Amino acid sequence: RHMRHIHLQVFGRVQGVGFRYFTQRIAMNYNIVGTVQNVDDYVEIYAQGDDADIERFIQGVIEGASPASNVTSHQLEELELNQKLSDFRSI
Secondary structure, X not given: OOEEEEEEEEEXXXXXXXXXXXXXXXXXXXXXXEEEEEEOOEEEEEEEEEHHXXXXXXXXXXXXXXXOOEEEEEEEEEEOOOOOOOOEEEO
């Protein structure tokens, strides 16, 4: 599969650390579209791009998108492609 679309939930010290702003720079680095959002006390991401770029994006986020972050856990789900995505947004 050339492209992937993923649901990524990241847990730990992931709020009040610039997580959404730092995730945006990683999305720009690897040509990723989708969203980053604060949900309750964790972070939820939808991410779409080429397979290797998605791998690079996941690792950059879960190794701590922000230097202030401490990611303790993540959950990943593989999704059907979303052809309405055209950029990466902090929501």
